[PDB]
Design a protein around this ligand. Structure first.
Ligand SMILES: *[C@H]1O[C@H](CO)[C@@H](O[C@H]2O[C@H](CO)[C@@H](O)[C@H](O)[C@H]2NC(C)=O)[C@H](O)[C@H]1NC(C)=O
Ligand SMILES: *[C@H]1O[C@H](CO)[C@@H](O)[C@H](O)[C@H]1NC(C)=O
Lengths: 9, 272, 99
């Protein structure tokens, strides 16, 4: 279950 | 007992070529069960473990989206960084990411972490409290701050505590009969014709799983832990690994030296 | 930053010349991930190989496991070649039976 990533690094 | 489900997705820069090759992978206790691979004719999250076939397309779709999305993130992102590191658009890079939750046999979560790295050397990582940010250098602290604005620590920590543990609890159930197999190691010793009029006892352990294994050479209860140059626990092939120990010993007196193998899967530790 | 490829070579079982075995060539600590591997035998590039478990440990080091279908013969001698940016020219590891 891979989670999403909004906050661009 | 306790467990860990972690994901290690990476991105390699191919500026001139046309697109980075973001590749994701997933583990449950050192065991790989899903891998993505943005260079394949058809990007698809294929099952590694056997126990992941029994899910369905309902779950195999819901995933490949998260996939392509982060693909964007690893792309968009990776680029901003050559700006930060004032590096001309050409030098291959590697943005990495790892995450997951560790659950105690009891049931509750024990610890969770998230980490990013750009070309190896650390760039930033969430602290234990799941609220703080350990930015690495000046160009990375830039991000620590920005993330505290939107609340990176409350968003990620959210996924950690519930869902990561949630799905974990699902995986283990689905693949219980396979995942908990503890293959015990096989005893083996060896002596070599070394030119010094010496011998070399090689304590060989094969086909074992898990890999966390203790192995030493003895001499009357006290352990010859200094002269025993051994290997780095390496993957045999099928799934069970192996390890070996070395102690250079002259003839005749050899019979006195011994080996010992400790491992989670034996009823009584082994002395050879 | 670059970390140099640690090469380990070994069989899948104790060798008794004859029996169809699986000769591996495990790598570790190379980085960046772009590495060239070559399986050998007396210099004739072994045609059939493998590429499995391309992942990374927490140390941000990418690795692999390559293996051919070698067959032990006391007179011959195997090896494993590998290229990786973090070094001038390719290193070569000729396999030692009891390791
Ligand atoms: C591991 O597989 C299942 C799932 O972890 C274990 O079953 C336990 O949990 C079930 C609910 O999911 C209960 O309904 C069962 O009563 C309970 N025990 C059994 C025997 O199903 C199972 O024990 C484990 N199997 C092994 C071989 O350890
Ligand atoms: C490279 O850019 C400047 C030179 O123009 C240099 O001083 C600096 O240390 C580098 N970039 C950053 C963000 O520090």
């Amino acid at each position: 279950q891979l989670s999403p990533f909004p906050f661009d690094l | 007992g306790p467990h860990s489900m972690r994901y290690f997705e990476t991105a390699v820069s191919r500026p001139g070529l046309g697109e980075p090759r973001y590749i994701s992978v997933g583990y449950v206790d050192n065991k790989e069960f899903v891998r993505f691979d943005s260079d394949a004719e058809n990007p698809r999250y294929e099952p590694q473990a056997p126990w992941m076939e029994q899910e369905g397309p309902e779950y195999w779709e819901r995933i490949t989206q998260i996939a392509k999305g982060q693909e964007q993130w690893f792309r968009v992102n990776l680029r901003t960084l050559l700006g930060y590191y004032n590096q001309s658009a050409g030098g291959t890079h590697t943005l990495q990411w790892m995450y997951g939750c560790d659950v105690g046999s009891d049931g509750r979560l024990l610890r969770g972490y998230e980490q990013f790295a750009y070309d190896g050397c650390d760039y930033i990582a969430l602290n234990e409290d799941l609220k703080t940010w350990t930015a690495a250098d000046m160009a990375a602290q830039i991000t620590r701050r920005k993330w505290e604005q939107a609340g990176a620590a409350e968003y990620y920590r959210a996924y950690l505590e519930g869902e990561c543990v949630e799905w974990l609890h699902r995986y283990l159930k689905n693949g219980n009969a396979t995942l908990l197999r503890t293959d015990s190691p096989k005893a083996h010793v060896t002596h070599h014709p070394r030119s010094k009029g010496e011998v070399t006892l090689r304590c060989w352990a094969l086909g074992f799983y898990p890999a966390d294994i203790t192995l030493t050479w003895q001499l009357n209860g006290e352990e010859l832990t200094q002269d025993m140059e051994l290997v780095e626990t390496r993957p045999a092939g099928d799934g069970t690994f192996q390890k070996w120990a070395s102690v250079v010993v002259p003839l005749g007196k050899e019979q006195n030296y011994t080996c010992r193998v400790y491992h989670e899967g034996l009823p009584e530790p082994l002395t050879l | 930053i670059q970390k140099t490829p640690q090469i380990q070579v070994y069989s899948r079982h104790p060798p008794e010349n004859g029996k169809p075995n699986i000769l591996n060539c495990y790598v570790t600590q190379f980085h960046p991930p772009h590495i060239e591997i070559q399986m050998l035998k007396n210099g004739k590039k072994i045609p059939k190989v493998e590429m499995s478990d391309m992942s990374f440990s927490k140390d941000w080091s990418f690795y692999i496991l390559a293996h051919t279908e070698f067959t032990p013969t006391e007179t011959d001698t195997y090896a494993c070649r590998v290229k990786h940016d973090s070094m001038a020219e390719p290193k070569t590891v000729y396999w030692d039976r009891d390791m």
